[PDB]
Amino acid sequence: NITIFTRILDGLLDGYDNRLRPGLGERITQVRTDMYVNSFGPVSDTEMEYTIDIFFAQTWKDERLRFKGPMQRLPLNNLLASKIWTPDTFFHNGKKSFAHWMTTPNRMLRIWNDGRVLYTLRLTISAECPMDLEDFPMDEQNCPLKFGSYAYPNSEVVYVWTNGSTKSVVVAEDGSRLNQYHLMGQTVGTENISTSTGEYTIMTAHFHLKRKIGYFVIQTYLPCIMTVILSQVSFWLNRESVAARTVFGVTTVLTMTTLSISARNSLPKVAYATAMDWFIAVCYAFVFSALLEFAFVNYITKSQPARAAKIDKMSRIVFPILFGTFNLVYWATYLN
Amino acid sequence: NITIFTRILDGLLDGYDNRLRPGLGERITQVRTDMYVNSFGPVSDTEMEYTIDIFFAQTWKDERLRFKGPMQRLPLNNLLASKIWTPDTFFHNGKKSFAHWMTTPNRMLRIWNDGRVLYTLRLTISAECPMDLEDFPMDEQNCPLKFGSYAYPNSEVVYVWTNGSTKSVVVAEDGSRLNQYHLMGQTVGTENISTSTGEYTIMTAHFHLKRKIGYFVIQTYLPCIMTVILSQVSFWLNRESVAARTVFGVTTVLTMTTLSISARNSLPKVAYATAMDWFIAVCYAFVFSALLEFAFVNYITKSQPARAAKIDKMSRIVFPILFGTFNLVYWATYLN
Amino acid sequence: NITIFTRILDGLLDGYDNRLRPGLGERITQVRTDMYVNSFGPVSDTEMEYTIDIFFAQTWKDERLRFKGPMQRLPLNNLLASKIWTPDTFFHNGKKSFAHWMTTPNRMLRIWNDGRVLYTLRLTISAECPMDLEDFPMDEQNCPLKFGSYAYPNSEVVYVWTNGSTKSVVVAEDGSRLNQYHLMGQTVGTENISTSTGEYTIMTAHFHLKRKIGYFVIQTYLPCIMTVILSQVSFWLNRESVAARTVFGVTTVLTMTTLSISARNSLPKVAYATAMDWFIAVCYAFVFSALLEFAFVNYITKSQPARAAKIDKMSRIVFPILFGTFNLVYWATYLN
Amino acid sequence: NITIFTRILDGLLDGYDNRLRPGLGERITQVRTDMYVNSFGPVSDTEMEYTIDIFFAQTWKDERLRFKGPMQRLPLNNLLASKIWTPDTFFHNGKKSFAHWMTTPNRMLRIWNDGRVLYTLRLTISAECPMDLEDFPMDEQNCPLKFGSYAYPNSEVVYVWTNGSTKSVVVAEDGSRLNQYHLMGQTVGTENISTSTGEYTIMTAHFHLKRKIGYFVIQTYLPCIMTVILSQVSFWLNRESVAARTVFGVTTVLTMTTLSISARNSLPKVAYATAMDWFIAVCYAFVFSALLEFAFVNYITKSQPARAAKIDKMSRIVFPILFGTFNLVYWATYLN
Amino acid sequence: NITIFTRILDGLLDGYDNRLRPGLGERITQVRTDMYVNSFGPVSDTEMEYTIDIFFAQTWKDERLRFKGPMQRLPLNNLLASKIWTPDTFFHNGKKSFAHWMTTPNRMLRIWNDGRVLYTLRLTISAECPMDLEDFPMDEQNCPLKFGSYAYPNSEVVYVWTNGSTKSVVVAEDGSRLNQYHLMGQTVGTENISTSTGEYTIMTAHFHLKRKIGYFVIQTYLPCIMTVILSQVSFWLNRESVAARTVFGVTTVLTMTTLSISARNSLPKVAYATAMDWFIAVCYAFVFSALLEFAFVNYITKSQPARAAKIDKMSRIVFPILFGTFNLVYWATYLN
Ligand SMILES: Cc1ccc(-c2noc(C)c2COc2ccc(C(=O)N3CCS(=O)(=O)CC3)cn2)cn1
Ligand SMILES: Cc1ccc(-c2noc(C)c2COc2ccc(C(=O)N3CCS(=O)(=O)CC3)cn2)cn1
Ligand SMILES: Cc1ccc(-c2noc(C)c2COc2ccc(C(=O)N3CCS(=O)(=O)CC3)cn2)cn1
Ligand SMILES: Cc1ccc(-c2noc(C)c2COc2ccc(C(=O)N3CCS(=O)(=O)CC3)cn2)cn1
Ligand SMILES: Cc1ccc(-c2noc(C)c2COc2ccc(C(=O)N3CCS(=O)(=O)CC3)cn2)cn1
Ligand SMILES: *[C@@H]1O[C@H](CO)[C@@H](O)[C@H](O)[C@H]1NC(C)=O
Ligand SMILES: *[C@@H]1O[C@H](CO)[C@@H](O)[C@H](O)[C@H]1NC(C)=O
Ligand SMILES: *[C@@H]1O[C@H](CO)[C@@H](O)[C@H](O)[C@H]1NC(C)=O
Ligand SMILES: *[C@@H]1O[C@H](CO)[C@@H](O)[C@H](O)[C@H]1NC(C)=O
Ligand SMILES: *[C@@H]1O[C@H](CO)[C@@H](O)[C@H](O)[C@H]1NC(C)=O
């Protein structure tokens, strides 16, 4: 009884040229693409890339594969995939992509009576996500994913998303888990491109990333903030304690200096200043400014002691107020 | 005499279609799975993954392979595996998996008279283990391992564990060795899932991990604890020793600051506070609070010296008591 | 109707030897090469290499592939590429190169009636870019890319760029994005080389890189600059404050020392001094010189106090002026 | 004349089934194994693994390959290896193994008239070496190497070492070169194991490793030792020099703290204390104890000055003596 | 006309056994080897390895390939290489080697009328270079490269260099570029070896490496030197400035301590002392000795002040002289 299926499979490959697209010289081959993101892999800011694992499904029509039988479908696997024609889909921005071959190549091939073909493949892509770290770490990124044909122009093969955007791209609930980003949502689009070899259609999927702050607060902001507060303690000491106040100013300045170095170790080596860098620079100014006040005070503590006390006493109020005022401006500016 | 075996092997492949599952159009193919964990590889907290090496065995039934002969079994190897039908089993959460091909592909294939088939394979998986590091390092993790068919829905192929849980998954005595975790035990389960391509059965194996503390005690807690004790020594010095007490407070504060940075270097860049972070923050408060006491004392050591001595003398008792009290609360809270 | 195409493909391979170049014993095979740089990958200064992803296109002529049919072209893919002759092009300076095989090998093959052949391939090269870091970080680099035949000398196969330089090599707008370099432009050239196996033609593409300063300003120059300013503050303190001025000098000297170590951690281990190293050395001299002034002053503050005050007072003006003067010379020298 | 050899090779494969072991249904296949270690690769303590490159030779008997000819042997290569039966030998503890394929697969195949077969293969294994770092760095490790059949039980295939232990496993003179270990010697053994699939024989080779101390002496012990001596210098200063003695105690305590962190950076993150950790802890106690002496002395330098001098004077002798005494106990204990 | 070549190629493979070496049972196969080093890759001191990219050429004689035709040579590629016999050459000390397969396998195959065969291959080897870092960084290393047959003993296949040493091994002008070594020259040699499988001839190429100092001067020596000079400044301060002189001694000692740790981070973890280590140890002694002088001086500044001044004054001359004297001995000793 099972032998019925075997004959059908042999019949389909009879007089079938895997080197020719369906509808050749008759129409334009139309491919419907849907994607499921099993896990949105890590985002390497330094490399401006991101890893993603997907189940890439392509559907099209091939009248050469029509058949009649008891079943309306023919589940299969990678065994028969090489024997027929499949689109030469590739990822323009994919720096390095590989498939999964254990235990068996994660591929599927299904055929219906009408000739509709479903080809599902599992992939792990490593794409490039250019980023503008001007508002870092309060930065929103739009990491794209582009794919299309490599040899079939828009006049031969066209890719279109299936149904609406939600059904076109799907992300698993546990997949949207990252240590430094939030996956706000996804969008899809298409656009033709003109090249030397001809016009091609490009399918694009954009992932909206909202950086989840809180690691940098515990890593950079708080040490910078507490270091500033430490420096202001020097204003509560007597002027004659030259050695004591010197330690506060010197140690704090160096501490802020090393924080700038440590902070950017993980950050990419971008040739421009980020929001965090500005915060550090201001914090450096406060600690450095406190040291200057002590030096200026100690330089006139003999000639005009009266003014020195006023400056030292006044500084106990001005510095905390300005730093608190700056934080409101800084946080409000980048959080709104 | 040996030629008898050769004829049987040739006979089996006669009229055998490797593209068709057994029982097609007659019943549902049933697959029995057992696992042996040779070594539970390292767990990368930063990557939220874990490596595992297993001997993956699948058993099923295929009447097309029935035979009669002197032997009740036909030991074989990977040579004949490609010639017959095997399930398209794959690991949903496996980021990257590879097999072992030295000296020979670590595969086995055994067949009985009744048609029962045993397919054993050796694998090294790299799966993803999401973790909630809220109680870190007193955190218990449940790293799963999911697998199932890629192309055969629940109506065609079903995976079931063999015998009880203990016989279904086995871990070698030396395999359950990790530098930062204890492998408390294992559990298995099944659950259907609905997808666009149809309903599939998912087989899940969970490994219960209990982090073995002791590295962080020697790395973070003790330096934090001894640093606090160092700061309290300043209370035993005279107030007039402004420079001396300043060194204690300043150095200790910076020391705690760098410990926070160093501690999280290995830790993943999670955007929330762990139990260890709270311990550091408290330790930072104690050292910082000690410095404030000296500053406050030095600010009134002239106007009201009597109260300054009381505060300095009293602080010699309050600070050690509170820190000791906090540790009991902290350790008891996270150890119960 | 489609069967017409199938016959043509079969006819072409009839009596076709893939082991023989076209024009053999009749003329010299001529290959036209064009390149498109999808993304100019990262430049590793330490490894003196750079990654690049390109679409490498080669065009030539083969009379054995002439055909007549309704279409003037035969779009194809990697399936037929192995069946015909293609040049043995390789990259002399490519340390490690690999192709992209997902979803399908990123290859194309097109044939015209006259026999013209177009072979397009996608590659990710890792070439070596020797650099002279004498003006670092104000250094301009010329990273080349060499390719040619491996077995066919200049008397058999010749590579020539197609059209002008602009059309020969093209760089995508988003491809020319690097964190520490600017892609000023590109140039191409050819040159024969003589070897033991014969004379070969070498095609070279040079990429002009202008390092984008700004990361090192925030990383090395500013900490060095502010550290110098910190040291000069010691001149505004009284001589009798021996301990205070000692802290300024000692801490600053050590701070500059560690900056030299930290700065070169990312820099390659080159056995010569860069421009940045000279800047650090001068900054080290200023901080060190300030300490000597204090030591010299403290050594004669008793015998001849009058001169000590003059030196300390004078140093408040000389040191800032010289450092400012040096910066103008340094920046102007390396920026012009 | 050479054609004689060609006929013999063709004759051997005539009626030869590569899927059947020799002696099947007649006897037990016996395999003689010898090993030559070209280079004992690096030992990664963190990963508890070790790399090794070997020439793995297996010898057995197959009457199906008997032949008569002028020569008593038939040197060959990997070309014919796939055409005959070879044991499915694999390494149980090998996490990742690969072969060498340049310029040609490093394989050999030799056959004698009697049917004796020699199969030599070159491998680079990455095995797991569990270690007990309780006596670290005075620790001796026994890194094993296990191999056996994957599909042929003890009733079908048996592995036995050839000749004595010395001839069974051989290590090249230059191979036994490691930066942190001494290869004292090797031992071999066999042992049956019972599994679900049947009983198998396991061949084990153990390498005895004696860690070569001297890197940790220059890295950890000496800095710890000299830091302690530095602290004891504070006892030779006057009590009134509160600031001076404070610097000694504070800096030394922090210095020991960072050494503990730095020391364990390379060391694996084991959740227990090593011998080196105990040495550090004692060194921390000495430096910390010295600071307490100064604090205690400074706290009673007014009420009872006489006793303070005795304690300070006495400490100049007690501390050096105890530290020297401890070292003898520590070194003698772990070196005997 | 071109069909003439096709017939010759078919004729050559007629009755050709790729499994048999030429001259079998008639003579000894003789192989002439020449090498061209495109780029002498990086040398990893930690791994005691070095990467190298070469064009490996082997020439021999095979009378079975004689032919007559208009041309005296038959340029070819990897297509025909597998169809004939090639030596099983392999690299004994090559830990990991791989070939280049883009755009086409970098292989060549040329045949002359007389039967002479040229086989050229491109390789990227990763060999092991044991080193004795006793004179480091003034160390000269001899990194070898060994290759020979894997299955053909000296009685069957012999490797010999072609022409003189200069023509046998060639290094490209730009290839001999390293960041920490100079490629002084190359030498070649041969030597038989006896093994269990028989006697084999080994071809060895040695590369003489002279480390280019200058990175360690800027990284270790200068910071060590300037740190010593910093300590000697303490001798120019008054004895009563106890706190000031303490900072000099304490900070300098710790600074030298961390330099020892930092210096060896890149250096391999060898269990013996290098020349640089001795230099550091002496520098540590000078800074430590200076601190002892201050402590000794401060301990007798009351009982016998006169001698204290002499020691402090004398030390201003002795210490600089000895350090300068030591450098001449150290540099002259290791530079001659
Ligand atoms: C599908 C295909 C494949 C091979 C080629 C090709 N063949 O020989 C050569 C020199 C090329 C480069 O032809 C291109 C390719 C891409 C683009 C383009 O529009 N981008 C924008 C989107 S992107 O993802 O940044 C990639 C670059 C322009 N010219 C053209 N088309
Ligand atoms: C067996 C199979 C393979 C290919 C597909 C498939 N084919 O084209 C497309 C777009 C898909 C995605 O279809 C899926 C896949 C998985 C799930 C699901 O239930 N998860 C929960 C457990 S998990 O391990 O996190 C993986 C995700 C949902 N839809 C479906 N099923
Ligand atoms: C195309 C080809 C391939 C195989 C060989 C070859 N075959 O056996 C052997 C020993 C060689 C080395 O023959 C060479 C190779 C290259 C050069 C040369 O001119 N460079 C300058 C430009 S480069 O990119 O730095 C590479 C080196 C000199 N001799 C020669 N020619
Ligand atoms: C030769 C072979 C290969 C496949 C299997 C197998 N097939 O399906 C399944 C579930 C298994 C696991 O069967 C095992 C395997 C090994 C052991 C054992 O005795 N160890 C001790 C030495 S070891 O090197 O640590 C490896 C573990 C126990 N059961 C059994 N034997
Ligand atoms: C050509 C070949 C290949 C396979 C074998 C072989 N086959 O089964 C086994 C156990 C061996 C090991 O046989 C050896 C191999 C090498 C040496 C030797 O002389 N060295 C010195 C130079 S070296 O480069 O350090 C490598 C080691 C000694 N015995 C012998 N000869
Ligand atoms: C691409 O070209 C086709 C030509 O028919 C056109 O219909 C389509 O709108 C184009 N796509 C875009 C985004 O312009
Ligand atoms: C999956 O579906 C089958 C349908 O027969 C059902 O018997 C089984 O209980 C289902 N599994 C679960 C976990 O619900
Ligand atoms: C290479 O050789 C050919 C020989 O015809 C010559 O025409 C060409 O100019 C040469 N190229 C260069 C750069 O000299
Ligand atoms: C393994 O089993 C065989 C059965 O004949 C026995 O002879 C041999 O001694 C056993 N090996 C060990 C180590 O017990
Ligand atoms: C190797 O053996 C051959 C035997 O003929 C001999 O001629 C040759 O000199 C030997 N090589 C060396 C280096 O001894």
d(CA B261, CA B216): 14
The 3-class SS string of A131-169 reads: CCCCCCCCCEEEEEEEEEECCCCCCCEEEEECCCHHHHE
Helix (H) or strand (E) holding D192, with range, is strand D181-194
Sign of the dihedral through C-alpha D259, D265, D271, D273: negative
Domain layout of chain C by residue ranges: 3-211, 215-334
Q: Among C45, C107, C154, C242, which would you mutate to test the E interface (most chain E Cβ atoms within 10 Å of its Cβ)?
A: C242
- Contact by Cβ (8 Å): B245, B294: yes
To which residue do tokens 């100092």 refer?
E213
Q: Looking at CA atoms only, how far is residue B271 from chain A in angstroms? A: 5
The 3-class SS string of chain E reads: CCHHHHHHHHHHHCCCCCCCCCCCCCCCEEEEEEEEEEEEEEEECCCCEEEEEEEEEEEEECHHHCCCCCCCECCECCCCHHHCCCCCEEECCEEEEEECCCCCCCEEEEEECCCEEEEEEEEEEEEECCCCCCCCCCCEEEEEEEEEECCCCCCCEEEEECCCHHHHEEECCCCCCCCCEEEEEEEEEEEEEECCCCEEEEEEEEEEEEECCCHHHHHHHHHHHHHHHHHHHHHHCCCCCHHHHHHHHHHHHHHHHHHHHHHHHHCCCCCCCCHHHHHHHHHHHHHHHHHHHHHHHHHHCCCCHHHHHHHHHHHHHHHHHHHHHHHHHHHHHHCC
Helix (H) or strand (E) holding C321, with range, is helix C305-334
Q: Which CATH architecture has domain C215-334?
A: Up-down Bundle (1.20)
Contacts of C61 (CB under 8 A, 6+ apart): C22, C23, C29, C30, C114, C115, C116, C117
- In this structure, the strands spanning A157-161 and A29-44 are parallel
Closest Cβ–Cβ partner in A53, A107, A248 for B250: A248
* Three-state secondary structure call for residue C334: helix
Helix (H) or strand (E) holding D242, with range, is helix D242-266
Asked if C3-211 and C215-334 have one fold, the answer is no
- Contact by Cβ (8 Å): E13, E44: no
Distances (CA, A) of A4 to A8, B22, B68: 7, 14, 27
- Contact by Cβ (8 Å): B271, A215: yes
Sign of the dihedral through C-alpha C253, C257, C258, C260: positive
Greatest C-alpha distance within chain C: 113
To which residue do tokens 């293969």 refer?
D121
- Contact by Cβ (8 Å): C224, C256: yes
Q: Which two tokens stand for residue E160?
A: 């010999």
Helix (H) or strand (E) holding A57, with range, is strand A49-61
* φ/ψ (deg, to 5) at D116: -65, 135
CA nearest to B53, candidates C179, C254, D93: D93
* φ/ψ (deg, to 5) at A163: 60, -150
d(CA E20, CA B58): 44
* Three-state secondary structure call for residue B236: helix
CA nearest to B289, candidates B329, B328, B332, B326: B326
Question: CB–CB of A288 and C226 under 8 A?
Answer: yes
Question: CB–CB of C150 and E107 under 8 A?
Answer: yes
To which residue do tokens 């707008």 refer?
C173
Helix (H) or strand (E) holding B266, with range, is helix B242-266
* φ/ψ (deg, to 5) at A112: -105, 170
Q: For residue B75, is the peptide bond before it cis, meaning its omega torsion is within 30 degrees of 0?
A: no
Cα dihedral angle (B132, B135, B137, B142), rounded to 10 degrees?
A: -40
Q: Looking at CA atoms only, how far is residue C2 from chain E in angstroms? A: 32
Q: CB count, 10 Å around CB of E169?
A: 21
Q: Which two tokens stand for residue D98?
A: 């690969």
d(CA C51, CA C49): 7
Contacts of A111 (CB under 8 A, 6+ apart): A12, A65, A67, A73, A74, A76, A117, A118
Q: How far is the CA of E192 from the centre of ligand 5 (A)?
A: 12
d(CA D293, CA D224): 20
d(CA B272, CA A218): 9
- Contact by Cβ (8 Å): A285, A322: no
* Three-state secondary structure call for residue B178: coil
Which residue type occupies B195?
T
Residue B15: Cβ-neighbour burial (10 angstroms; 0-12, 13-18, 19+): exposed
Question: CB–CB of D226 and E284 under 8 A?
Answer: yes
Q: How far is the CA of E193 from the centre of ligand 10 (A)?
A: 10
Ligand number nearest CA of B198 is 2
- Contact by Cβ (8 Å): D33, D57: yes
Q: Among B14, B18, B19, B194, which would you mutate to test the A interface (most chain A Cβ atoms within 10 Å of its Cβ)?
A: B19
Instruction: For residue E118, list chain C residues with Cβ-Cβ distance below 8 A.
Output: 197
Q: Among B1, B2, B227, which would you mutate to test the D interface (most chain D Cβ atoms within 10 Å of its Cβ)?
A: B2
To which residue do tokens 């004591």 refer?
A244
Question: CB–CB of C215 and A271 under 8 A?
Answer: yes
- Beta partners for residue A111, in sequence order: A117
* Three-state secondary structure call for residue C196: coil
What letter would DSSP give residue B64? Answer: G
- Beta partners for residue A119, in sequence order: A58, A109
* Three-state secondary structure call for residue A171: strand
What letter would DSSP give residue D150? Answer: S
To which residue do tokens 């992932």 refer?
A207
- In this structure, the strands spanning D157-161 and D29-44 are parallel
D162 part of contact set with chain B, CB < 8 Å: no
d(CA E226, CA C253): 9
Helix (H) or strand (E) holding C248, with range, is helix C242-266
CA nearest to C203, candidates C155, C168, C167, C172: C168
D193 part of contact set with chain B, CB < 8 Å: no
For B:210-229, CB contacts with A below 8 A are: none
Question: CB–CB of A150 and C107 under 8 A?
Answer: yes
Cα dihedral angle (A282, A283, A285, A286), rounded to 10 degrees?
A: 120
Q: Does domain E3-211 have CATH number 3.30.1330.10?
A: no
Distances (CA, A) of D41 to B102, D54, E212: 18, 10, 28
* Three-state secondary structure call for residue D162: coil
* Three-state secondary structure call for residue C162: coil
Distances (CA, A) of E214 to C313, E137, E211: 39, 10, 9
What letter would DSSP give residue C106? Answer: S
CA nearest to C278, candidates C290, C286, C268: C286
How far does CA C140 lie from the centroid of its chain?
9
The closest-lying atom of ligand 4 relative to the alpha carbon of residue D196 is 13
Q: CB count, 10 Å around CB of E304?
A: 10
Q: How far is the CA of C29 from the centre of ligand 3 (A)?
A: 21
Q: Which two tokens stand for residue A9?
A: 């499979």
Closest Cβ–Cβ partner in C53, C102, C213 for A123: C102
Q: How far is the CA of D122 from the centre of ligand 5 (A)?
A: 10
CA nearest to B2, candidates C272, E312, D25, E151: D25
For E:20-79, CB contacts with C below 8 A are: 34, 36, 38-39, 41-42, 53, 57, 70-71, 75-77, 79
Tell me the DSSP string of A228-286: HHHHHGGGGS-TT-HHHHHHHHHHHHHHHHHHHHHHHHHS---SS--HHHHHHHHHHHH
- Beta partners for residue D99, in sequence order: D123
Closest Cβ–Cβ partner in A6, A226, A233 for B17: A6
Q: Looking at CA atoms only, how far is residue E41 from chain C in angstroms? A: 9
Residue A306: Cβ-neighbour burial (10 angstroms; 0-12, 13-18, 19+): exposed
- Contact by Cβ (8 Å): A95, C39: yes
Q: CB count, 10 Å around CB of B239?
A: 15
Q: For residue A137, is the peptide bond before it cis, meaning its omega torsion is within 30 degrees of 0?
A: yes
